[PDB]
């Protein structure tokens, strides 16, 4: 059946635990670590503070062509673990280069404001 | 909602009805389908048929005649019927001469790159131009054209994402209808009280119905048997006018109905819509609008520069146009039909009025 959308979210919502666990979503981020053994990945982003994680699982996808600190785009769903907290089960992902992260952030912020503008 | 319930048939006074619109995918489902006619949908009054949407593909069902690609764009998701196309009449690859080799090679470049734009895999960015359809109660898009978006980075996606609210607020959010609403409002609708007026309304409805049915030729009796046209014609006005033959109300009124049908088709001849070819018949008529044949001929006689003059003429003059047509085809070609076709041609972009009375193509 037709899946729920890749609605846009950013690391702040997972770090703030705002975006509920067990829900679909889409985000970009900066590659930090990759585990070839267990097929697990960490992307990082900081709220002008300590870098905040995003736990991801390499399912049906290939994590290539961009490096650590370089940029990637993912969509899927997150689920909780007591020790690990929660991890995104990927559904689509790819590397991307030459991006304008503040611009994307402005885009999503405007988009959400416009959502607020809907009666 | 009156304002939402825009004039019947949702006329193209509002331009968007003719051009691919750009709405959020999520909104594409929230719109209604028109209860007046299927195959058309509504948003804030503005009627929509052709839609434009760009996102990423997330699922596939492959069929013999079409593919079915599930597509997402952030706000929502849908599935899209992407009719396929085969390469019938295959172009071979041969060591042709310089010109032929170059033509074939460039054609092959174009073809292979078209394939690369056409072929697709999940997660990719996809653009589709097409219209809204519904099936199994589910709403979908049947694409007129679709191609892979070759962007290496989200910049163009970003542009679209930033844009859509802009175009919404500028154009689509505008509900108002600025038409003057110059409606007749059924004045003397059930009875014209005047056989000429009845004939005028009859010709109106009859040309409407003929253009609807696209009938190119017709015997007048064929038209005289139409249910709606009959109903319009047999209103009490004609029964009262033909009532002088009290002993033959039925017969006199039916004869008057046939006569007023004749009068309507004659009014059409006068206005150049229909005409009686040199068919030797007494009530056979050919409709100009459907007369693609005469369109083609009169387009030949100037599209190919006017053949009679040696001098480098830019086109031809109304009178010489008419005269060369009557010379090459038939003197009986009325000026009314000639005017009608000259109008329709420039409507079609098959002729242009550089001035009045002289035209080119």
Short mmCIF file of C-alpha atoms in Angstrom, two decimals:
data_model
loop_
_atom_site.label_atom_id
_atom_site.label_comp_id
_atom_site.label_asym_id
_atom_site.label_seq_id
_atom_site.Cartn_x
_atom_site.Cartn_y
_atom_site.Cartn_z
CA UNK A 1 0.00 0.00 0.00
CA UNK A 2 1.00 3.65 -0.39
CA UNK A 3 3.27 4.59 2.55
CA UNK A 4 2.89 7.63 4.76
CA UNK A 5 4.91 10.61 3.47
CA UNK A 6 8.49 11.61 4.11
CA UNK A 7 7.44 14.64 6.12
CA UNK A 8 10.35 16.97 6.81
CA UNK A 9 12.10 17.04 10.17
CA UNK A 10 15.49 18.04 11.54
CA UNK A 11 17.73 16.69 14.30
CA UNK A 12 16.38 19.16 16.84
CA UNK A 13 13.05 17.35 16.98
CA UNK A 14 14.61 13.97 17.72
CA UNK A 15 17.07 15.54 20.15
CA UNK A 16 14.18 17.37 21.80
CA UNK A 17 12.31 14.07 21.65
CA UNK A 18 9.52 16.11 20.08
CA UNK A 19 8.91 14.04 16.95
CA UNK A 20 7.18 10.94 18.35
CA UNK A 21 8.95 7.60 18.25
CA UNK A 22 7.36 5.18 15.83
CA UNK A 23 6.58 7.67 13.07
CA UNK A 24 7.67 8.45 9.53
CA UNK A 25 9.81 11.46 8.67
CA UNK A 26 12.60 12.82 6.47
CA UNK A 27 15.83 14.68 7.27
CA UNK A 28 19.26 15.65 6.03
CA UNK A 29 22.40 15.55 8.15
CA UNK A 30 26.19 15.33 8.44
CA UNK A 31 27.77 11.87 8.40
CA UNK A 32 29.69 11.04 11.57
CA UNK A 33 30.15 7.24 11.91
CA UNK A 34 29.37 4.06 9.95
CA UNK A 35 29.43 0.45 11.16
CA UNK A 36 30.05 -1.98 8.31
CA UNK A 37 29.66 -4.87 10.77
CA UNK A 38 26.18 -4.12 12.13
CA UNK A 39 25.01 -1.78 9.33
CA UNK A 40 24.46 1.19 11.64
CA UNK A 41 25.18 4.87 11.04
CA UNK A 42 25.43 8.05 13.10
CA UNK A 43 24.82 11.51 11.67
CA UNK A 44 25.52 14.61 13.73
CA UNK A 45 24.24 18.15 14.04
CA UNK A 46 24.58 20.71 16.83
CA UNK A 47 22.10 23.26 18.17
CA UNK A 48 25.02 25.66 18.40
CA UNK A 49 26.04 23.28 21.18
CA UNK A 50 27.30 19.73 21.54
CA UNK A 51 26.61 17.66 18.44
CA UNK A 52 23.33 15.74 18.61
CA UNK A 53 23.09 12.23 17.20
CA UNK A 54 20.72 10.59 14.76
CA UNK A 55 20.77 6.79 14.87
CA UNK A 56 20.17 5.09 11.51
CA UNK A 57 20.07 1.56 10.10
CA UNK A 58 21.44 0.78 6.62
CA UNK A 59 18.46 -1.04 5.13
CA UNK A 60 18.01 -1.41 1.35
CA UNK A 61 20.55 1.41 0.70
CA UNK A 62 24.25 2.08 0.00
CA UNK A 63 26.14 4.74 2.06
CA UNK A 64 28.59 5.93 -0.60
CA UNK A 65 30.01 8.87 -2.60
CA UNK A 66 30.03 11.33 0.34
CA UNK A 67 32.39 11.31 3.33
CA UNK A 68 32.27 11.97 7.07
CA UNK A 69 31.24 15.56 7.67
CA UNK A 70 29.78 15.50 4.16
CA UNK A 71 26.04 15.51 3.67
CA UNK A 72 23.29 12.90 3.26
CA UNK A 73 19.49 12.80 2.99
CA UNK A 74 17.27 10.13 4.56
CA UNK A 75 13.63 9.21 5.07
CA UNK A 76 12.06 6.40 7.07
CA UNK A 77 10.85 5.88 10.64
CA UNK A 78 12.31 5.85 14.14
CA UNK A 79 11.78 3.30 16.91
CA UNK A 80 12.96 3.18 20.50
CA UNK A 81 15.61 1.22 22.38
CA UNK A 82 16.30 1.37 26.10
CA UNK A 83 20.09 1.41 25.69
CA UNK A 84 20.42 3.02 22.25
CA UNK A 85 17.40 5.30 22.72
CA UNK A 86 15.94 5.15 19.22
CA UNK A 87 17.06 4.44 15.66
CA UNK A 88 15.76 5.39 12.23
CA UNK A 89 14.89 2.44 10.05
CA UNK A 90 15.71 3.84 6.63
CA UNK A 91 13.39 3.67 3.63
CA UNK A 92 15.29 5.91 1.20
CA UNK A 93 18.65 7.62 1.50
CA UNK A 94 21.36 9.08 -0.71
CA UNK A 95 24.44 11.25 -0.56
CA UNK A 96 24.23 14.89 -1.57
CA UNK A 97 26.97 17.44 -2.16
CA UNK A 98 27.09 21.21 -2.54
CA UNK A 99 24.09 21.94 -0.33
CA UNK A 100 22.89 25.09 1.43
CA UNK A 101 21.79 23.85 4.84
CA UNK A 102 20.68 27.24 6.22
CA UNK A 103 18.58 27.67 3.10
CA UNK A 104 16.90 24.30 3.61
CA UNK A 105 16.28 25.25 7.22
CA UNK A 106 14.69 28.52 6.15
CA UNK A 107 12.60 26.55 3.66
CA UNK A 108 11.22 24.15 6.25
CA UNK A 109 10.69 26.92 8.79
CA UNK A 110 8.70 28.92 6.24
CA UNK A 111 6.81 25.79 5.23
CA UNK A 112 5.77 25.13 8.82
CA UNK A 113 4.81 28.77 9.35
CA UNK A 114 2.62 28.55 6.26
CA UNK A 115 1.10 25.41 7.76
CA UNK A 116 0.34 27.52 10.84
CA UNK A 117 -1.24 30.02 8.47
CA UNK A 118 -3.82 27.46 7.32
CA UNK A 119 -7.27 27.96 8.81
CA UNK B 1 -21.19 27.82 -1.33
CA UNK B 2 -22.35 30.05 -4.17
CA UNK B 3 -18.98 31.71 -4.80
CA UNK B 4 -17.41 28.25 -4.89
CA UNK B 5 -20.22 27.07 -7.19
CA UNK B 6 -18.83 28.91 -10.19
CA UNK B 7 -20.75 29.19 -13.49
CA UNK B 8 -21.86 25.92 -14.98
CA UNK B 9 -19.32 23.91 -17.00
CA UNK B 10 -16.57 26.02 -15.34
CA UNK B 11 -15.67 28.13 -18.33
CA UNK B 12 -12.11 28.99 -19.24
CA UNK B 13 -12.56 32.66 -18.48
CA UNK B 14 -10.24 31.83 -15.61
CA UNK B 15 -7.03 31.03 -17.50
CA UNK B 16 -5.72 28.19 -15.33
CA UNK B 17 -8.09 25.71 -16.92
CA UNK B 18 -5.81 25.48 -19.96
CA UNK B 19 -2.38 25.24 -18.28
CA UNK B 20 -0.62 22.76 -16.00
CA UNK B 21 -1.20 23.89 -12.41
CA UNK B 22 1.27 23.71 -9.51
CA UNK B 23 -0.39 22.65 -6.22
CA UNK B 24 0.97 20.82 -3.18
CA UNK B 25 0.67 17.09 -3.74
CA UNK B 26 -1.23 16.82 -0.44
CA UNK B 27 -3.85 19.26 -1.72
CA UNK B 28 -4.41 17.27 -4.91
CA UNK B 29 -6.65 14.87 -3.01
CA UNK B 30 -8.54 17.46 -0.95
CA UNK B 31 -10.06 18.97 -4.11
CA UNK B 32 -13.50 17.91 -5.30
CA UNK B 33 -14.34 16.31 -8.59
CA UNK B 34 -16.97 18.34 -10.41
CA UNK B 35 -20.47 16.95 -9.99
CA UNK B 36 -21.42 18.57 -13.30
CA UNK B 37 -18.97 16.58 -15.42
CA UNK B 38 -16.38 13.88 -14.67
CA UNK B 39 -12.74 14.35 -15.54
CA UNK B 40 -12.44 17.84 -14.01
CA UNK B 41 -11.76 19.00 -10.47
CA UNK B 42 -12.10 22.14 -8.38
CA UNK B 43 -10.01 24.24 -6.00
CA UNK B 44 -11.15 27.55 -4.55
CA UNK B 45 -13.49 27.86 -7.54
CA UNK B 46 -10.77 27.83 -10.17
CA UNK B 47 -11.29 24.69 -12.29
CA UNK B 48 -8.34 22.38 -12.86
CA UNK B 49 -7.68 19.60 -15.32
CA UNK B 50 -3.96 19.67 -16.09
CA UNK B 51 -1.65 19.31 -13.09
CA UNK B 52 2.10 19.57 -12.53
CA UNK B 53 3.86 17.83 -9.64
CA UNK B 54 7.46 16.91 -8.86
CA UNK B 55 8.76 14.68 -6.07
CA UNK B 56 10.42 11.30 -5.57
CA UNK B 57 9.25 7.85 -6.60
CA UNK B 58 8.83 5.29 -3.83
CA UNK B 59 7.11 2.27 -5.39
CA UNK B 60 6.52 0.56 -8.72
CA UNK B 61 3.97 -1.68 -10.40
CA UNK B 62 5.02 -2.51 -13.96
CA UNK B 63 2.45 -3.45 -16.60
CA UNK B 64 2.37 -4.25 -20.30
CA UNK B 65 0.91 -0.89 -21.40
CA UNK B 66 1.82 1.40 -18.50
CA UNK B 67 3.87 1.70 -15.38
CA UNK B 68 2.36 2.79 -12.07
CA UNK B 69 4.77 4.85 -9.98
CA UNK B 70 4.03 5.83 -6.41
CA UNK B 71 5.28 9.36 -5.83
CA UNK B 72 5.88 11.44 -2.71
CA UNK B 73 6.49 15.11 -2.09
CA UNK B 74 6.76 15.85 1.59
CA UNK B 75 3.19 16.97 2.19
CA UNK B 76 1.67 13.80 0.76
CA UNK B 77 1.75 10.89 -1.67
CA UNK B 78 -0.12 9.58 -4.71
CA UNK B 79 0.29 7.04 -7.52
CA UNK B 80 0.76 7.94 -11.19
CA UNK B 81 -0.30 6.08 -14.35
CA UNK B 82 2.65 6.51 -16.73
CA UNK B 83 1.59 5.18 -20.11
CA UNK B 84 4.49 3.59 -21.94
CA UNK B 85 5.51 3.92 -25.57
CA UNK B 86 7.20 1.44 -27.89
CA UNK B 87 9.80 2.12 -30.59
CA UNK B 88 7.74 0.87 -33.53
CA UNK B 89 9.39 1.58 -36.88
CA UNK B 90 12.88 0.87 -35.59
CA UNK B 91 15.72 3.11 -36.75
CA UNK B 92 18.67 0.98 -37.81
CA UNK B 93 22.36 1.70 -37.19
CA UNK B 94 24.28 1.64 -40.47
CA UNK B 95 27.43 3.21 -41.95
CA UNK B 96 25.46 5.82 -43.87
CA UNK B 97 27.02 8.72 -45.75
CA UNK B 98 28.19 11.87 -43.95
CA UNK B 99 24.81 13.62 -43.81
CA UNK B 100 22.75 10.46 -43.28
CA UNK B 101 25.24 9.09 -40.76
CA UNK B 102 25.11 12.38 -38.86
CA UNK B 103 21.30 12.46 -38.90
CA UNK B 104 21.03 8.87 -37.70
CA UNK B 105 23.70 9.43 -35.06
CA UNK B 106 22.11 12.58 -33.64
CA UNK B 107 18.75 10.82 -33.68
CA UNK B 108 20.33 7.97 -31.72
CA UNK B 109 21.88 10.38 -29.23
CA UNK B 110 18.47 11.96 -28.69
CA UNK B 111 16.78 8.57 -28.42
CA UNK B 112 19.21 7.04 -25.93
CA UNK B 113 19.23 10.14 -23.76
CA UNK B 114 15.42 10.18 -23.87
CA UNK B 115 15.54 6.60 -22.60
CA UNK B 116 17.86 7.63 -19.79
CA UNK B 117 15.41 10.39 -18.88
CA UNK B 118 12.49 7.95 -19.09
CA UNK B 119 13.91 5.00 -17.15
CA UNK B 120 13.64 5.34 -13.42
CA UNK B 121 14.36 3.70 -10.07
CA UNK B 122 12.94 4.18 -6.58
CA UNK B 123 14.16 7.17 -4.60
CA UNK B 124 14.77 9.21 -7.73
CA UNK B 125 13.30 12.61 -8.44
CA UNK B 126 10.54 12.55 -11.05
CA UNK B 127 8.47 15.15 -12.90
CA UNK B 128 5.09 14.44 -14.46
CA UNK B 129 2.78 16.55 -16.62
CA UNK B 130 -0.76 15.24 -16.82
CA UNK B 131 -4.33 15.25 -15.54
CA UNK B 132 -6.38 13.98 -12.61
CA UNK B 133 -8.17 10.62 -12.92
CA UNK B 134 -9.84 8.33 -10.40
CA UNK B 135 -10.24 4.57 -10.38
CA UNK B 136 -11.30 1.93 -7.85
CA UNK B 137 -12.43 4.99 -5.85
CA UNK B 138 -8.73 6.04 -5.71
CA UNK B 139 -7.46 9.32 -7.18
CA UNK B 140 -4.36 9.30 -9.40
CA UNK B 141 -2.51 11.19 -12.15
CA UNK B 142 -2.34 10.05 -15.78
CA UNK B 143 0.77 11.75 -17.07
CA UNK B 144 1.00 13.37 -20.46
CA UNK B 145 4.78 13.60 -20.10
CA UNK B 146 7.26 12.46 -17.46
CA UNK B 147 11.03 12.73 -17.19
CA UNK B 148 13.80 12.16 -14.67
CA UNK B 149 14.90 15.34 -12.91
CA UNK B 150 18.65 15.35 -13.51
CA UNK B 151 19.55 17.55 -10.53
CA UNK B 152 22.61 16.48 -8.51
CA UNK B 153 21.50 18.53 -5.48
CA UNK B 154 18.28 19.64 -3.81
CA UNK B 155 18.58 23.24 -5.04
CA UNK B 156 15.74 23.02 -7.56
CA UNK B 157 13.60 21.08 -5.10
CA UNK B 158 14.37 23.87 -2.67
CA UNK B 159 13.26 26.45 -5.21
CA UNK B 160 9.96 24.69 -5.80
CA UNK B 161 9.38 24.25 -2.07
CA UNK B 162 9.94 27.94 -1.46
CA UNK B 163 7.85 28.89 -4.48
CA UNK B 164 4.61 26.96 -4.14
CA UNK B 165 3.32 29.13 -1.26
CA UNK B 166 4.09 32.19 -3.36
CA UNK B 167 2.09 31.07 -6.38
CA UNK B 168 -0.67 29.89 -4.05
CA UNK B 169 -1.04 33.29 -2.41
CA UNK B 170 -0.65 35.18 -5.69
CA UNK B 171 -2.93 33.21 -8.01
CA UNK B 172 -4.65 30.17 -6.59
CA UNK B 173 -5.91 31.67 -3.34
CA UNK B 174 -7.82 34.28 -5.38
CA UNK B 175 -11.43 33.03 -5.48
CA UNK B 176 -13.22 36.01 -6.95
CA UNK B 177 -15.08 35.91 -10.27
CA UNK B 178 -14.87 39.16 -12.22
CA UNK B 179 -17.21 38.17 -15.06
CA UNK B 180 -20.07 40.58 -15.71
CA UNK B 181 -22.59 37.69 -15.81
CA UNK B 182 -24.55 38.77 -18.88
CA UNK B 183 -27.24 36.09 -18.69
CA UNK B 184 -30.39 36.11 -20.79
CA UNK B 185 -32.29 34.59 -17.84
CA UNK B 186 -35.05 32.78 -19.75
CA UNK B 187 -36.87 35.74 -21.28
CA UNK B 188 -39.48 34.19 -23.58
CA UNK B 189 -37.82 30.81 -23.06
CA UNK B 190 -40.99 28.64 -23.26
CA UNK B 191 -42.24 30.65 -26.25
CA UNK B 192 -40.55 33.10 -28.62
CA UNK B 193 -43.87 34.57 -29.86
CA UNK B 194 -42.08 35.13 -33.18
CA UNK B 195 -41.20 32.50 -35.78
CA UNK B 196 -38.01 34.42 -36.72
CA UNK B 197 -37.00 34.56 -33.06
CA UNK B 198 -37.84 30.89 -32.64
CA UNK B 199 -35.73 30.20 -35.73
CA UNK B 200 -32.80 32.15 -34.31
CA UNK B 201 -32.89 30.27 -31.01
CA UNK B 202 -33.36 27.03 -32.96
CA UNK B 203 -30.28 27.73 -35.06
CA UNK B 204 -28.35 28.54 -31.89
CA UNK B 205 -29.24 25.25 -30.21
CA UNK B 206 -28.82 23.29 -33.44
CA UNK B 207 -25.35 24.58 -34.27
CA UNK B 208 -24.45 24.01 -30.64
CA UNK B 209 -25.64 20.41 -30.87
CA UNK B 210 -23.97 19.80 -34.23
CA UNK B 211 -20.63 21.13 -33.04
CA UNK B 212 -21.12 18.94 -29.98
CA UNK B 213 -21.76 15.80 -32.02
CA UNK B 214 -19.05 16.84 -34.52
CA UNK B 215 -21.33 15.85 -37.41
CA UNK B 216 -19.76 17.07 -40.66
CA UNK B 217 -22.75 16.58 -42.97
CA UNK B 218 -26.42 15.88 -42.46
CA UNK B 219 -29.74 15.68 -44.25
CA UNK B 220 -32.11 18.28 -42.84
CA UNK B 221 -34.60 15.58 -41.85
CA UNK B 222 -31.87 13.97 -39.74
CA UNK B 223 -31.74 17.18 -37.71
CA UNK B 224 -35.52 17.67 -37.74
CA UNK B 225 -35.81 14.43 -35.72
CA UNK B 226 -33.59 15.48 -32.81
CA UNK B 227 -35.43 15.34 -29.49
CA UNK B 228 -34.09 18.54 -27.93
CA UNK B 229 -34.27 20.52 -31.18
CA UNK B 230 -37.83 19.31 -31.79
CA UNK B 231 -38.85 20.20 -28.23
CA UNK B 232 -37.41 23.67 -28.74
CA UNK B 233 -39.16 24.08 -32.09
CA UNK B 234 -42.60 22.72 -31.17
CA UNK B 235 -43.25 25.27 -28.42
CA UNK B 236 -46.80 26.67 -28.35
CA UNK B 237 -45.73 29.61 -30.53
CA UNK B 238 -45.50 27.53 -33.71
CA UNK B 239 -48.70 25.66 -32.85
CA UNK B 240 -50.54 28.97 -32.48
CA UNK B 241 -49.05 30.44 -35.66
CA UNK B 242 -49.97 27.38 -37.75
CA UNK B 243 -53.38 27.09 -36.05
CA UNK B 244 -55.20 28.79 -38.94
CA UNK B 245 -55.61 25.28 -40.38
CA UNK B 246 -57.67 24.23 -37.38
CA UNK B 247 -58.82 21.04 -39.11
CA UNK B 248 -55.17 19.98 -39.56
CA UNK B 249 -53.40 21.31 -36.46
CA UNK B 250 -51.06 18.31 -36.40
CA UNK B 251 -50.25 18.35 -40.12
CA UNK B 252 -49.95 22.13 -40.48
CA UNK B 253 -47.83 22.37 -37.33
CA UNK B 254 -45.50 19.56 -38.41
CA UNK B 255 -45.11 21.20 -41.82
CA UNK B 256 -44.41 24.53 -40.10
CA UNK B 257 -41.82 22.77 -37.93
CA UNK B 258 -40.11 21.36 -41.02
CA UNK B 259 -40.25 24.81 -42.62
CA UNK B 260 -38.76 26.53 -39.57
CA UNK B 261 -36.03 23.88 -39.48
CA UNK B 262 -35.34 24.75 -43.11
CA UNK B 263 -35.31 28.39 -42.04
CA UNK B 264 -32.80 27.70 -39.27
CA UNK B 265 -30.41 25.84 -41.56
CA UNK B 266 -30.84 28.64 -44.09
CA UNK B 267 -29.91 31.14 -41.39
CA UNK B 268 -26.81 29.04 -40.81
CA UNK B 269 -25.99 29.21 -44.52
CA UNK B 270 -26.49 32.98 -44.36
CA UNK B 271 -24.09 33.06 -41.40
CA UNK B 272 -21.77 30.62 -43.17
CA UNK B 273 -21.86 27.78 -40.65
CA UNK B 274 -23.35 25.20 -43.03
CA UNK B 275 -23.70 24.94 -46.78
CA UNK B 276 -25.21 22.65 -49.41
CA UNK B 277 -22.42 21.11 -51.46
CA UNK B 278 -23.02 20.52 -55.17
CA UNK B 279 -24.42 17.14 -54.18
CA UNK B 280 -27.59 17.43 -56.26
CA UNK B 281 -29.75 17.02 -53.14
CA UNK B 282 -32.36 19.45 -51.84
CA UNK B 283 -31.86 19.26 -48.06
CA UNK B 284 -28.30 17.95 -47.62
CA UNK B 285 -25.88 20.28 -45.85
CA UNK B 286 -22.18 20.26 -44.97
CA UNK B 287 -21.02 22.13 -41.88
CA UNK B 288 -18.12 24.50 -42.49
CA UNK B 289 -16.62 24.07 -39.03
CA UNK B 290 -16.02 20.37 -39.73
CA UNK B 291 -15.03 21.15 -43.34
CA UNK B 292 -11.38 20.26 -42.78
CA UNK B 293 -11.25 19.65 -46.53
CA UNK B 294 -11.92 23.26 -47.51
CA UNK B 295 -9.68 24.37 -44.65
CA UNK B 296 -6.85 22.35 -46.16
CA UNK B 297 -7.50 23.63 -49.69
CA UNK B 298 -7.69 27.31 -48.81
CA UNK B 299 -4.62 26.76 -46.64
CA UNK B 300 -2.80 25.26 -49.63
CA UNK B 301 -3.54 28.23 -51.84
CA UNK B 302 -1.52 30.60 -49.65
CA UNK B 303 0.51 28.47 -47.24
CA UNK B 304 2.27 27.65 -50.44
CA UNK B 305 2.79 31.23 -51.60
CA UNK B 306 0.10 32.46 -53.98
CA UNK B 307 0.72 30.46 -57.12
CA UNK B 308 -0.66 32.79 -59.79
CA UNK B 309 1.63 35.83 -59.30
CA UNK B 310 5.29 35.73 -60.23
CA UNK B 311 6.06 38.62 -57.88
CA UNK B 312 7.14 37.79 -54.33
CA UNK B 313 3.72 38.21 -52.74
CA UNK B 314 3.53 37.91 -48.92
CA UNK B 315 0.06 36.27 -49.14
CA UNK B 316 -3.13 37.13 -50.99
CA UNK B 317 -6.06 39.53 -51.01
CA UNK B 318 -9.55 38.66 -49.80
CA UNK B 319 -11.04 39.08 -53.27
CA UNK B 320 -8.27 37.17 -55.04
CA UNK B 321 -8.41 34.51 -52.34
CA UNK B 322 -12.14 34.13 -52.97
CA UNK B 323 -11.68 34.24 -56.74
CA UNK B 324 -8.88 31.67 -56.89
CA UNK B 325 -10.91 29.41 -54.60
CA UNK B 326 -13.99 29.71 -56.81
CA UNK B 327 -11.76 29.15 -59.84
CA UNK B 328 -10.01 26.05 -58.52
CA UNK B 329 -13.03 24.53 -56.73
CA UNK B 330 -16.47 26.03 -57.35
CA UNK B 331 -17.94 29.47 -58.14
CA UNK B 332 -20.84 28.67 -55.80
CA UNK B 333 -18.62 29.03 -52.73
CA UNK B 334 -20.49 31.64 -50.69
CA UNK B 335 -18.62 34.51 -49.08
CA UNK B 336 -20.18 33.61 -45.72
CA UNK B 337 -18.42 30.25 -45.55
CA UNK B 338 -15.22 31.87 -46.78
CA UNK B 339 -15.37 34.40 -43.95
CA UNK B 340 -16.11 31.66 -41.42
CA UNK B 341 -13.15 29.56 -42.53
CA UNK B 342 -10.86 32.59 -42.61
CA UNK B 343 -11.83 33.25 -38.99
CA UNK B 344 -11.34 29.66 -37.88
CA UNK B 345 -7.96 29.43 -39.59
CA UNK B 346 -6.40 32.30 -37.66
CA UNK B 347 -8.02 30.86 -34.56
CA UNK B 348 -6.03 27.70 -35.35
CA UNK B 349 -2.88 29.67 -36.29
CA UNK B 350 -3.22 28.45 -39.89
CA UNK B 351 -3.63 32.02 -41.22
CA UNK B 352 -2.77 35.50 -39.95
CA UNK B 353 -4.40 38.87 -40.67
CA UNK B 354 -1.51 41.18 -41.45
CA UNK B 355 -4.31 43.63 -42.28
CA UNK B 356 -7.96 43.47 -43.18
CA UNK B 357 -8.70 42.05 -46.66
CA UNK B 358 -5.16 40.66 -47.11
CA UNK B 359 -3.86 37.58 -45.32
CA UNK B 360 -0.88 35.24 -45.22
CA UNK B 361 -0.07 31.75 -43.95
#
